[model samples]
Target: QTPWWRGAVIYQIYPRSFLDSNGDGVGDLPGIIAKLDYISGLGVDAIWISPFFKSPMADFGYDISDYRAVDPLFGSLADFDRLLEKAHGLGLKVMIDQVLSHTSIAHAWFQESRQDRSNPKADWYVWADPREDGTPPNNWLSLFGGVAWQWEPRREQYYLHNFLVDQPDLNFHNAEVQQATLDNVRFWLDRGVDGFRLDAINFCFHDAQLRDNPAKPADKRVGRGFSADNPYAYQYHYFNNTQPENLPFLERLRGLLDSYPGAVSLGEISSEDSLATTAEYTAQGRLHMGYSFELLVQDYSAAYIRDTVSRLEATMLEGWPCWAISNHDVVRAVTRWGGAQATPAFARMVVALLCSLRGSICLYQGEELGLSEAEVAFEDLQDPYGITFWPTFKGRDGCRTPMPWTDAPSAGFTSGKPWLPLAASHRAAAVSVQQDDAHSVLRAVRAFLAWRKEMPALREGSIAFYDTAEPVLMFRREHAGQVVLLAFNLSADPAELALPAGEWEQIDVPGVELGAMDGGHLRLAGHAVVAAVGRG
Candidate 1:
């Protein structure tokens, strides 16, 4: 029997930006319904919709006020039902974002819980009394910035918020809160959603003691959160998240998901030891899959990729990982990996490599259009995190901008005011522009996915890295009696890739027509990727 998630491709869609059907300048469930055919055409097995729940937009919908209801800004419950039915008709499994780590301060639970600790919902959020000096109880830091503590005048106590002040962290220690979250998930499952893309799953639990985290030794601390511009990466970050108790919660969440057939859970983990924790979380009972910021970092080196996977393999058995080159949170992979100007070849190479990785894969919207990160001015910044720390870090608004549907004045995303300004560079790469081109990135992606469907070795196979120097990374993927050797050249300079003893033969990769090779060495051009298949 084959694994459910292995070799699967999931396409992530940010609801507010995917498409605007109501002329409301916001992408809604109805708009997504209109574009179901486009997504289905991409050969993606699943679609991961970002948070669309009722919210104050504090964290752009991550701070959910009502988990079961759809935001009026997006659509109604009927629209969401239509989206589910349409996607199902197109053979695309729909997975929605479950923002379980925190909830909007406006949520009824938080509203009641903050009312002097005596209300029925008192323990729903992580709250504690202030210290003698009126400071926070501990040295917890928020992912957004500054202190994680926010004082509530009603109760005169501080509440933990891993993100914004409006988004208070939920208390996983409270059985009622856990049950409520699980019920929220069940609502979506019952609504016919295939699975969940759990937002900040590791943040579900925190140290009950509220202990101060230790400072990092200067040398040991390095850039962790995409760039060194943010000081949040400078700390050791030991006790705030990834509490041992979190594993049990994962098991509980997994157990809840197991009740539904073909229902999967993909966790987003951001911890001090995220890679090790990711491996550990999926190694145990509950988590079906987990993905860390390992591939999202600035390190685009071949050795970095190999070592990261190797380290995880060393600790995790039967654990599943998901690899993505781009997402809404970080800078686009085109610009993130190849700064300033990126090439079409590099984009194709990244896609090819992501497909050959050990676990499941995710393709960000606009990635298939070969879209690069757009430049956003400081004054136009909509991201609160980016607005707070502008000039150094421009937040994720640049990448999260509205998708270009056509070459119209507003790129057809909307006729009204869009959520974010359209990137000028995205004009030529619009969906309409690429759809007609046979050599377009969208065409390449569709072809690759079609070809990959039958390659079992490239799906649930074991990975082995060949001993090669910089610029060239070669690995063998083997499953059952099938094997595929994937080679990638990361540099601009052409290099020779050494293959382990084999009567190697170059295979035509459809859209990606690689050059020829001789002897045991294959020559690869800069920023190029090629594959070979044959018995050793």
Candidate 2:
């Protein structure tokens, strides 16, 4: 059987912002169905829609109340069925986000588990007795803020909530809970979803002993969605997540996936040792793919990119890796890495670099248009994480703005006001405008993706990095007797590198302007990229 996800390009659509079909200032399944043709036309193999399940919107669908039901805000089960049918009809696989690590406080399981200790579902969530001083069970902290434990008056015990208080952590240690989560997954499989993007899969299993996580040194702290001021990064987090037990659970998940032919599982893992954990999770009989926030960081250097990919390749011999530069959780790639005044050329170059990497690629919505991060006022901010931190960290609302299809009011996203305002800069990069301009970033992305599909070496191959300094990243992708050389000048300044000894034939890659190739030295202009095949 063919592994369709191998080297495939997956487009991630944040349902809340994709399109608002009901004019309710929110996007729904029907809205996505209307845009199915537009997505498939981009040449992507699959679409990963962010949470649209029955949710209270406390964490905006991340706080799922029902795993199998669709929220009325996003339409019903029939709407999803129509979406699945439409996407499949267009030859596009549909993958949905599954947040199994935790659930909304309003969920039936949580409600039943929270009421007194003797309930049938009492062990469904992590609950521990408070210390004699009336403090939390341990020093563990929530990803949002303060303690990870919350006092449940009904049970008279503190329950674990790794994220928001409304999103309580599920006890995977309970055999019943694990089986229930798997059964929920099987429900989706039975519905014909191509696969699942397991949200925070590493956080599913915690240290059974509930050991206190050791604090990290001040210099060792690195923040993802959390602000530097937030204490979540102060600890090493070894005990809270990325536990050894997660491996067996993954094997079970893989077994379930095996029963459904052509279905796949992509795990999202974040830990002190994210790269190593990803390697372990995707190894034989586990997840089909794994990705972390390594590339989503602020580092824009050619050296950093080369090091990240090379390191993963070296460590993940048997695992398949998925890569993304931007997502709903992070700032837009162009704004984060390309500076405040990034050019369109810089935007196109990043897509070329991402596509050339030796792994599957996930393109965030609006990435094709080179849309920079929107600026939401403090009053307009909706992400609780951002609101808690305030001015220091503006939160994720900027990147979650509605997709600008046209320059019309609300960018043609909704007939009424959008839940999140559209970015002014995004108006210039709107799909309606770019559809007519061949030089637009959207066009470049389409060209590069189409061009990449034909290069087998790039699609699934062994990657080797050359010893290049600073803004120059040089690598080779080889597969099945075919070898291709990829070179990029990631900076604004002109740079040159000595080409490897060989007879090289320059292969034209769409959306990229190649540098001049002399006898032995290859000179690259600002933001230039070049690909070549070995003539010998």
Top TM-score hit: 2
Candidate 2 per-residue lDDT, tens place, 1-536, comes to 34899998999999999999989899888889999999998989999999999999988899999999999999999999999999999999999999999999999999999999999999989999999999997899998877999999998899999999999999999999999999999999999999999999999988878899998888888876565568998898889888888889999999999999999899988888789899999999999999899999887787889889988989997888899999999999999999899888889999889888988889999988899999998878899878877777777898999999998868889999899888889887899999999999889889998998898898988789998998899999998899999899999889988998888878788987678777778899999987889889
Off by over 4 Å in 1: 226-229
The Cα error of candidate 2 at residue 137, in Å, is 1.1
lDDT of 1: 0.83
Model 1: C-alpha RMSD to truth?
1.4
TM-score of each model, in listed order = 0.97, 0.99
Q: lDDT values of the candidates?
A: 0.83, 0.90
Across 307-347, the per-residue lDDT of candidate 1 in tens digits comes to 88888777777678788888989888988897788877777
Off by over 4 Å in 2: none
The alpha-carbon RMSD values of the candidates against the true structure, listed in the order shown, are 1.4, 1.0
Model 1 lDDT at residue 222: 59
